[PDB]
Design an enzyme around this catalytic site. Structure first.
Site, PDB file in Angstrom:
ATOM      1  N   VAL D  60      41.832  31.177  65.562  1.00 53.22           N
ATOM      2  CA  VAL D  60      40.285  31.794  65.799  1.00 53.22           C
ATOM      3  C   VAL D  60      39.573  30.659  65.694  1.00 53.22           C
ATOM      4  O   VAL D  60      38.149  31.158  66.031  1.00 53.22           O
ATOM      5  CB  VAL D  60      40.586  32.528  64.529  1.00 53.22           C
ATOM      6  CG1 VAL D  60      41.393  34.045  63.930  1.00 53.22           C
ATOM      7  CG2 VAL D  60      40.062  31.270  63.344  1.00 53.22           C
ATOM      8  N   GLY D 147      30.593  23.837  44.810  1.00 54.13           N
ATOM      9  CA  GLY D 147      31.750  22.975  45.875  1.00 54.13           C
ATOM     10  C   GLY D 147      31.662  23.894  47.396  1.00 54.13           C
ATOM     11  O   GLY D 147      32.919  23.577  48.281  1.00 54.13           O
ATOM     12  N   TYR D 151      31.393  26.943  52.682  1.00 55.50           N
ATOM     13  CA  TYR D 151      32.079  28.334  53.028  1.00 55.50           C
ATOM     14  C   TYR D 151      31.149  29.287  53.071  1.00 55.50           C
ATOM     15  O   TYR D 151      30.951  30.309  53.411  1.00 55.50           O
ATOM     16  CB  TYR D 151      33.187  28.551  51.769  1.00 55.50           C
ATOM     17  CG  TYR D 151      34.070  29.559  51.747  1.00 55.50           C
ATOM     18  CD1 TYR D 151      34.986  29.439  52.097  1.00 55.50           C
ATOM     19  CD2 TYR D 151      33.324  30.974  50.416  1.00 55.50           C
ATOM     20  CE1 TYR D 151      35.658  30.789  52.354  1.00 55.50           C
ATOM     21  CE2 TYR D 151      34.478  31.878  50.477  1.00 55.50           C
ATOM     22  CZ  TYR D 151      35.299  32.049  51.339  1.00 55.50           C
ATOM     23  OH  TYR D 151      36.247  33.447  51.154  1.00 55.50           O
ATOM     24  N   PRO D 181      34.504  41.085  49.390  1.00 52.57           N
ATOM     25  CA  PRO D 181      34.856  40.676  47.716  1.00 52.57           C
ATOM     26  C   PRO D 181      35.066  39.404  47.026  1.00 52.57           C
ATOM     27  O   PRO D 181      34.116  38.542  47.110  1.00 52.57           O
ATOM     28  CB  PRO D 181      36.631  40.679  49.004  1.00 52.57           C
ATOM     29  CG  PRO D 181      35.456  41.314  50.212  1.00 52.57           C
ATOM     30  CD  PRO D 181      35.052  40.005  50.144  1.00 52.57           C
ATOM     31  N   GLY D 182      34.850  39.948  46.009  1.00 48.77           N
ATOM     32  CA  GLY D 182      35.088  39.209  44.359  1.00 48.77           C
ATOM     33  C   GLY D 182      36.348  38.697  44.299  1.00 48.77           C
ATOM     34  O   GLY D 182      36.977  38.198  45.910  1.00 48.77           O
ATOM     35  N   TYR D 183      36.668  38.244  43.710  1.00 50.44           N
ATOM     36  CA  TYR D 183      37.868  37.341  42.742  1.00 50.44           C
ATOM     37  C   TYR D 183      39.234  38.857  43.453  1.00 50.44           C
ATOM     38  O   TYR D 183      38.842  39.442  42.606  1.00 50.44           O
ATOM     39  CB  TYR D 183      38.122  36.665  41.536  1.00 50.44           C
ATOM     40  CG  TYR D 183      37.105  35.956  41.383  1.00 50.44           C
ATOM     41  CD1 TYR D 183      37.682  34.540  41.568  1.00 50.44           C
ATOM     42  CD2 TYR D 183      36.560  36.202  40.756  1.00 50.44           C
ATOM     43  CE1 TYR D 183      37.834  33.278  41.526  1.00 50.44           C
ATOM     44  CE2 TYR D 183      35.482  34.481  40.283  1.00 50.44           C
ATOM     45  CZ  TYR D 183      35.575  33.245  40.703  1.00 50.44           C
ATOM     46  OH  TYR D 183      35.176  32.522  40.896  1.00 50.44           O
TER      47      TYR D 183
HETATM   48  N1  LIG Z   1      41.458  35.992  48.026  1.00 48.18           N
HETATM   49  C1  LIG Z   1      39.800  36.697  47.647  1.00 48.18           C
HETATM   50  O1  LIG Z   1      39.661  36.594  46.018  1.00 48.18           O
HETATM   51  C2  LIG Z   1      38.693  36.694  48.808  1.00 48.18           C
HETATM   52  C3  LIG Z   1      37.931  37.316  48.039  1.00 48.18           C
HETATM   53  C4  LIG Z   1      36.596  36.864  48.778  1.00 48.18           C
HETATM   54  C5  LIG Z   1      36.904  36.483  50.434  1.00 48.18           C
HETATM   55  N2  LIG Z   1      37.797  36.366  50.560  1.00 48.18           N
HETATM   56  C6  LIG Z   1      37.757  35.669  52.158  1.00 48.18           C
HETATM   57  O2  LIG Z   1      39.429  36.956  52.804  1.00 48.18           O
HETATM   58  C7  LIG Z   1      40.140  36.416  53.871  1.00 48.18           C
HETATM   59  C8  LIG Z   1      41.022  36.379  53.331  1.00 48.18           C
HETATM   60  O3  LIG Z   1      41.994  35.423  52.855  1.00 48.18           O
HETATM   61  P1  LIG Z   1      43.191  35.352  51.778  1.00 48.18           P
HETATM   62  O4  LIG Z   1      42.259  35.589  50.484  1.00 48.18           O
HETATM   63  O5  LIG Z   1      44.192  36.332  52.293  1.00 48.18           O
HETATM   64  O6  LIG Z   1      43.878  34.128  51.687  1.00 48.18           O
HETATM   65  P2  LIG Z   1      44.944  33.383  52.590  1.00 48.18           P
HETATM   66  O7  LIG Z   1      46.949  34.513  52.790  1.00 48.18           O
HETATM   67  O8  LIG Z   1      44.813  31.986  52.878  1.00 48.18           O
HETATM   68  O9  LIG Z   1      44.800  34.161  54.376  1.00 48.18           O
HETATM   69  C9  LIG Z   1      43.561  33.442  55.700  1.00 48.18           C
HETATM   70  C10 LIG Z   1      43.728  33.196  56.403  1.00 48.18           C
HETATM   71  O10 LIG Z   1      43.585  33.010  57.087  1.00 48.18           O
HETATM   72  C11 LIG Z   1      44.448  32.558  58.697  1.00 48.18           C
HETATM   73  N3  LIG Z   1      44.149  31.528  59.706  1.00 48.18           N
HETATM   74  C12 LIG Z   1      43.383  30.848  59.008  1.00 48.18           C
HETATM   75  N4  LIG Z   1      42.990  29.398  59.926  1.00 48.18           N
HETATM   76  C13 LIG Z   1      43.608  30.515  60.557  1.00 48.18           C
HETATM   77  C14 LIG Z   1      43.429  30.241  62.218  1.00 48.18           C
HETATM   78  N5  LIG Z   1      43.243  29.206  62.618  1.00 48.18           N
HETATM   79  N6  LIG Z   1      43.485  30.761  63.481  1.00 48.18           N
HETATM   80  C15 LIG Z   1      44.042  32.124  62.739  1.00 48.18           C
HETATM   81  N7  LIG Z   1      44.585  32.002  61.522  1.00 48.18           N
HETATM   82  C16 LIG Z   1      44.057  31.365  60.394  1.00 48.18           C
HETATM   83  C17 LIG Z   1      45.716  32.351  57.871  1.00 48.18           C
HETATM   84  O11 LIG Z   1      46.016  33.397  59.068  1.00 48.18           O
HETATM   85  P3  LIG Z   1      47.964  32.763  58.670  1.00 48.18           P
HETATM   86  O12 LIG Z   1      48.386  33.485  58.005  1.00 48.18           O
HETATM   87  O13 LIG Z   1      49.188  33.199  59.670  1.00 48.18           O
HETATM   88  O14 LIG Z   1      48.540  31.168  58.696  1.00 48.18           O
HETATM   89  C18 LIG Z   1      45.634  33.897  57.022  1.00 48.18           C
HETATM   90  O15 LIG Z   1      46.062  35.225  56.665  1.00 48.18           O
HETATM   91  C19 LIG Z   1      39.095  34.866  54.097  1.00 48.18           C
HETATM   92  O16 LIG Z   1      38.378  35.281  54.824  1.00 48.18           O
HETATM   93  C20 LIG Z   1      38.730  34.730  52.344  1.00 48.18           C
HETATM   94  O17 LIG Z   1      37.207  33.645  52.566  1.00 48.18           O
HETATM   95  C21 LIG Z   1      39.278  36.042  49.737  1.00 48.18           C
END
Ligand SMILES: NC(=O)c1ccc[n+]([C@@H]2O[C@H](COP(=O)([O-])OP(=O)(O)OC[C@H]3O[C@@H](n4cnc5c(N)ncnc54)[C@H](OP(=O)(O)O)[C@@H]3O)[C@@H](O)[C@H]2O)c1
Ligand SMILES: NC(=O)c1ccc[n+]([C@@H]2O[C@H](COP(=O)([O-])OP(=O)(O)OC[C@H]3O[C@@H](n4cnc5c(N)ncnc54)[C@H](OP(=O)(O)O)[C@@H]3O)[C@@H](O)[C@H]2O)c1
Lengths: 245, 245, 241, 245
Positions: D60, D147, D151, D181-183
């Protein structure tokens, strides 16, 4: 005297900021871009109107250019107490027309610049227990604008940076704030044909006039003052009522 | 000289605002609640410190009381150029325990007051093409607080008023803004035992200190100055980083 | 079923919310200012409501209404504070009577209707409170110092209450609609809609009351439990922040 | 059926989004990153739980990679009706310690991605008069975080993009919205040891629990529904009350 660095300090808003900070008793250092061949003439003009500035070349989109620029300023002038991240460009095109080069130019110049210029001054501010960092955003970061997916992304991102850094260093007497101006009477806006100003620009502004660059400079001087130490992480709108929330 | 009216002008934050506006060069008039037994003693003390104020009794919750108060100020002192709506109370109770009497006390004193005090001064400001209205809110209007359904409703309501009024009168040279302070070192807060301040209050504030009422007063003076004319309909946070958005 | 109360639930946006919440599986109760024709029509359409007359500006009226509802239907799980009026006038001309009418009807009502239902929600560990505000609370509007003050104040209430009761499974949220195709708006002549209203709306059309009702149904659902203290804009892009 | 593309569709939140959009009746295509060697296994797992997904590789952060990915999807599956920009990473470091590599990684992956993925799908949505674009931000874009100058800048920038694009294409039946989203109870949050969850994480959340990825997926599905056409340019907080404004 506090030492202040104003990026884009010879441009429309930048000059007004530089003039006001000088007038407030700060020692002001401006940067000029690689496209700017008028630094000598500007310095002479400013001195003719009674003010002495220092000027250094920088490319705010380049990390190393910024680091080296700040190194020279610290060597020649002294430690940086105030940083105004004012440099910025537009490359307006609807998403349908917008290409990667024009997306990138705006993100790198308008948002990366905040990282690039702020990182090399923060340690000194924290160590001394005093600093002011002011990021110049836009009403269009707050409300969005047609033709400005790039500009709005960068300008809204600036305020994300402001809040995170504010949290990191507030305890050390350093404040970090965003200023979001509306339409200002700078060259590129006062050049707009009268029919467009009257029908398209001014009707968006409840105040019924353009903002003066000097008015935004006054707000920046306030934020940079010793009595503004309890303001941090904020985004102050100066837009004549164009946007409210 | 501009004439300024500062409601709740004799204690806490109000006194700081009144002193600052006086020292900014304005002719300052304070209001005090009708059963405040120390108006003449206050004026004496202020005059002993070289400041000449006027003071009038008002119940800011009472519409007719406010109209009549402004009439006397206009008769005796002169037309009102600046109004700072600072009067307010807290009657904290969780919704479970909150009664209608204490709901009403806070709405009437903190929100109806803005209508009651602002209405009688606006036409003059509009007629003359210059005015400043500054409404003092709270960080808790922005973020909410336990026990403050009443206070947050009033204080958030004040900013809705700010924005609508700002739209009505922007074109006539009058600005209307909200200021939202965090924890300030007024008598009621410094009375907090030092251990409670250090373990419970300060950890909520990234700056690591209470705000000075003089810092908030400086912000109000900036908004009231001739160079703040392009700031309207805004809500400026002065909270040491306690809340960001 | 959950039991839902919708204030002002027999007309306009209120009616659309009431219908949608019934169709979502809730037992719905509506209030109106001092109902058989509407109730019978809704019954013919396969929907069983209860209707109560209430003055939402009056604390005791609200307490007594909720008592009847708990008797006739059962404990209230969902409250939509939708009742509200406008009394538009510039500050220069706005009188105290019309300031008061709007603050009491639009803002006091939130306290009056929510206080008598909240304890039960907390006791049971589940509830949904939705406050219907307006885009004009977010942006201000000429002639609406009263209305914007009341509608902005509603969201101050939302945030404080949300903090009080989030840990007990109750959510509190504000919904801020733009221009809707309710009766008094669709009565606007098409030439005026086209030249004066629609140019304010990037979507280029009025919002449907049913679209706002769908958002309220989402918030009132079992799956919206992590949304609280929020103000959700549904305005076709008319305002962004 | 509408065709939806979910970037990061095999990760914690992305999988939940993908499952809910499938269950809502959409044909779901996921992307997988260069470092993901588990696509085959994930497709098998998802089908064993009753669901059929398509999966395509993409980076991406790279404009050409995204254009090629979209070309293949349109060729093999059909025109894209729904896009969820969910891919994102963290590289958490205070500004004092944050280097340009890790600044860049987060800006390019989290913010450039919104341009890179959205540009190639938008013309088709406009042409057909129907589209849904949902950008996954974060509570930390709203409030900032220690930190996370990188982001929060990226995540706040996403919403600037949202607002400008929403204005460009609202008239054509396409909506663009941000979800913050939050945590959430994704792998890396649930991995946090119990002492830190109990003392540092959960006390920030008035709900007293982590958000379920399925709850965020529910909101995304709502935004992608036919009934959500009047919601555009918004930023919807789903954070258990962690931040309010
Ligand atoms: N979990 C939380 O508490 C939380 C809270 C607020 C926001 N978010 C947001 O939710 C979104 C999803 O994150 P997550 O929490 O589910 O953690 P995650 O499992 O680490 O998901 C991140 C996703 O990003 C994809 N990705 C990263 N770099 C990429 C690249 N260069 N090209 C294509 N795909 C890429 C990964 O793809 P692959 O799996 O195929 O490697 C992965 O599925 C993020 O934008 C994050 O900021 C999460
Ligand atoms: N005018 C308005 O109405 C308005 C409203 C809201 C926000 N703003 C913001 O105000 C700021 C200043 O712009 P302006 O209105 O004063 O327009 P401007 O005269 O074009 O100034 C832009 C400044 O950016 C500097 N710059 C651009 N690229 C650079 C690079 N790679 N390295 C170093 N410096 C670079 C330029 O420096 P040189 O002059 O040395 O080339 C110039 O002074 C911008 O951030 C803009 O987003 C303006």
């Amino acid at each position: 005297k506090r030492i202040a660095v104003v990026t884009g300090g010879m441009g429309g808003l930048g000059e007004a900021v530089s003039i006001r900070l000088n007038d407030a008793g700060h020692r002001v250092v401006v940067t000029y871009s690689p496209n700017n061949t008028g630094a000598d003439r500007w310095l002479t003009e400013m001195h003719a109107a009674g003010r002495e500035f220092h000027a250094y070349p920088v490319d705010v989109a380049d990390h190393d250019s910024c680091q080296q620029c700040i190194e020279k300023i610290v060597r020649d002038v002294g430690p940086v107490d105030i940083l105004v991240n004012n440099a910025g460009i537009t490359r307006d095109m609807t998403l349908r027309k917008l290409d990667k080069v024009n997306w990138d130019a705006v993100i790198r110049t308008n948002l990366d610049s905040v990282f690039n210029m702020t990182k090399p001054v923060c340690d000194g501010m924290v160590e001394r227990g005093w600093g002011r960092i002011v990021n110049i955003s836009s009403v269009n970061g707050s409300k969005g604008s047609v033709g400005q997916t790039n500009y709005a992304a960068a300008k809204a991102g600036m305020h994300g940076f402001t809040k995170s850094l504010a949290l990191e260093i507030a305890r050390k007497g350093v404040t970090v704030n965003t200023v979001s101006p509306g339409y200002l009477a700078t060259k590129m806006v006062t050049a707009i044909p009268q029919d467009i100003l009257d029908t398209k620009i001014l009707p968006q502004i409840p105040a019924g006039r353009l903002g003066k660059p000097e008015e935004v400079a006054a707000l920046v001087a306030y934020l940079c003052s010793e009595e503004a130490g309890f303001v941090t992480g904020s985004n102050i709108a100066i837009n004549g009522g164009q946007h409210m929330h």
